[PDB]
């Protein structure tokens, strides 16, 4: 509830951003950093009170666990149009492509990666969909195929887990998280090639 | 955090051994022995997990707002293997780890009305010392329907509104004996029963 606009006591609303204003410009710049050849049709702010409450609880918990670190990253997730309503209302669900770094939900550092047709599948009118996502990446390690949770931070204590996994710890391009409410879909970009 | 919990002194997790003669022990033992009178309880431990409890209580408040005057919470049983007890105590019930049930009503975490069901060796596997383990679990069953093997999420209430979902599924709406839940923090492991033949 920062840039959020009044919901008239609704628990969910999608708010189309005004082009040229501060917020729209901030999100468009994140995308055009690597996707400047695309065409943005609109950016929508996702105001989902329940998803936000659940996410903020996990953030407070991870801030306490990781004795004061920035546990949050702003990442991208391409989806097909038929998945957009579900994610808007319910967020990202690992139980719903290639799971090379584990059976989790995947998020890209670069819009360009999420802009692949394999992730942001064009609909019948050629429109592609990509979320801008607050992700609790926390303390992370290299993933591997078949993980169902992150590995332990010390194998001597096998329930004290990493927060997420990546392809490459030193220069990450993707992150996988394995729990509900570790990812908040903040904006939806509708765009074309 | 509930006022009856042991003071945990800045720590986020503790198991508390209950005393026979306490109402708290006696009620869990009666709920268990109702259908498992042939088994014998070694101990009942109260699970105090601050973070699990916070996430669960947030999901309960949301369901109590969404559903309007529904009894959304049931106290149910879950049999566990000894090797899984440390993970459940710390992190709760993860659908991605769940076994395939003999009668599947969906891919999620299963919870039994009757301790007898959870007491089967298939769920509460005897450890190397012949100890079996069963959780007593606060489950947000909410509004439910008969499930089906294909489900990875609860089904929609209405096929023309795919995102407005049942809270859980059962084997039988008229006479429910099991409940399946498909999301994290919909189940709080409240008590661990250690028992033997
Ligand atoms: C392998 O790394 C990625 C990186 C980014 C993405 C993404 O944006 N959307 C989707 S949808 C299923 C897989 C992915 C994915 C996977």
User: Which residues form the pocket of ligand 1, taking CB atoms under 6 Å from any ligand atom?
Assistant: A 76-78, 97, 106, 108, 113-114, 119, 174
Which residues of A lie closer than 8 Å to B, measured between beta carbons?
11, 50, 53-54, 57-58, 61, 64, 85-86, 88-90, 93-96, 103, 148-149, 158-159, 161, 178-181
CA distance A73 to A183: 10
DSSP string computed for B75-121: EEEEEE-GGGHHHHHHH---GGGPPPPSS-SSSSEEEESSHHHHTST
CA distance A95 to A179: 10
Tokens 């998803």 label which residue?
A: A51
Q: Answer whether A95 sits within 8 Å of B153, measured CB to CB.
A: yes
Neighbours of B33 (CB within 10 A): 14
Distance A116 CA to ligand 1 centre (A): 9
Instruction: Indicate the Cα dihedral angle A72, A75, A80, A86, nearest 10°.
Output: 20
CA distance A154 to A168: 19
Phi-psi region of B7 (alpha: psi -120 to 50; beta: other; left: phi over 0): beta
From chain B, pick out residues whose CB is under 8 angstroms from the CB of A50: 62
DSSP string computed for A94-163: TT----TT-SSEEEESSHHHHTSTTTS---TTS-EEEEEEEEE--SEEE--TT-SSPPEEETTEEEEE-S
- Residue A28: C-alpha distances to residues A20, A24, B66, B79, B115 (Å): 10, 6, 34, 50, 55
Q: Which residues contact A124 (CB under 8 A, 6 or more apart)?
A: none
Question: If DSSP codes are grouped into helix, strand and coil, which group holds residue A50?
Answer: helix
**Which residue among A106, A132, A147 has the greatest number of ligand 1 atoms within 8 angstroms of its CB, and so is best to mutate?**
A106
- Which tokens is B174 given? 């008229």
Instruction: Indicate the Cα dihedral angle B92, B60, B5, B108, nearest 10°.
Output: -20
CA distance B61 to B74: 15
Q: Which helix (H) or strand (E) holds A69?
A: none
Neighbours of B103 (CB within 10 A): 10
Strand pairing category for A140-142 and B156-158: unpaired
In our burial notation (b when 16+ CB lie closer than 10 A, e otherwise), range B47-76 reads bbbebbbbbbbbbbebbbeeeeeeebbbeb
CA distance A100 to A110: 18
Neighbours of A153 (CB within 10 A): 14
> Do A157 and A150 touch, CB atoms closer than 8 A?
no
Picking from A8, A187, A191, A165, the residue whose alpha carbon sits closest to that of residue A94 is A165
Backbone φ and ψ of A153, nearest 5°: -75, -25
CA distance B85 to A19: 53
How is chain A split into domains, by residue range? 1-193
Q: Which helix (H) or strand (E) holds B191?
A: strand B187-196
Q: Which helix (H) or strand (E) holds B194?
A: strand B187-196
Min distance B75 CA to chain A CA atoms (Å): 23
CA distance B92 to B85: 9
Distance A176 CA to ligand 1 centre (A): 9
> By CA distance, what is B106's nearest residue in A?
A95
Strand pairing category for A140-142 and A164-166: parallel
**Which residue among A30, A113, A137 has the greatest number of ligand 1 atoms within 8 angstroms of its CB, and so is best to mutate?**
A113
CA distance B15 to B4: 14
From chain B, pick out residues whose CB is under 8 angstroms from the CB of A86: 162-163
> Do B124 and A176 touch, CB atoms closer than 8 A?
no
> Do A114 and A189 touch, CB atoms closer than 8 A?
no
Min distance B62 CA to chain A CA atoms (Å): 7
Q: Answer whether B153 sits within 8 Å of A61, measured CB to CB.
A: no
């Amino acid at each position: 509830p920062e840039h959020w606009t009044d919901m008239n006591h609704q628990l969910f609303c999608m708010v189309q951003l005004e082009p040229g204003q501060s917020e729209y410009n901030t999100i468009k710049d994140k995308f055009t950093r690597t996707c400047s050849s695309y065409a943005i049709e609109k950016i929508e702010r996702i105001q989902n009170a329940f998803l936000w409450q659940s996410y903020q609880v996990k953030k407070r918990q991870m801030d306490i666990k990781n004795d004061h670190k920035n546990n949050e990253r702003l990442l991208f997730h391409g989806t097909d149009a038929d998945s957009v309503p579900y994610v808007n209302q319910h967020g990202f669900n690992r139980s719903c492509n290639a799971v090379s770094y584990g059976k989790g939900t995947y998020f890209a550092v670069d819009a360009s990666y999420s802009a692949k047709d394999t992730y942001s599948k064009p609909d019948s009118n050629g429109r592609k969909h990509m979320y801008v996502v607050r992700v609790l990446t926390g303390v992370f390690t290299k993933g591997r195929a078949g993980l169902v949770t992150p590995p332990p931070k010390n194998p001597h204590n096998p329930t004290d887990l990493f927060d997420s996994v990546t392809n490459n710890t030193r220069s990450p391009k993707l992150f996988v998280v394995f729990f509900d409410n570790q990812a908040y879909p903040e904006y939806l970009i509708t765009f074309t090639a």
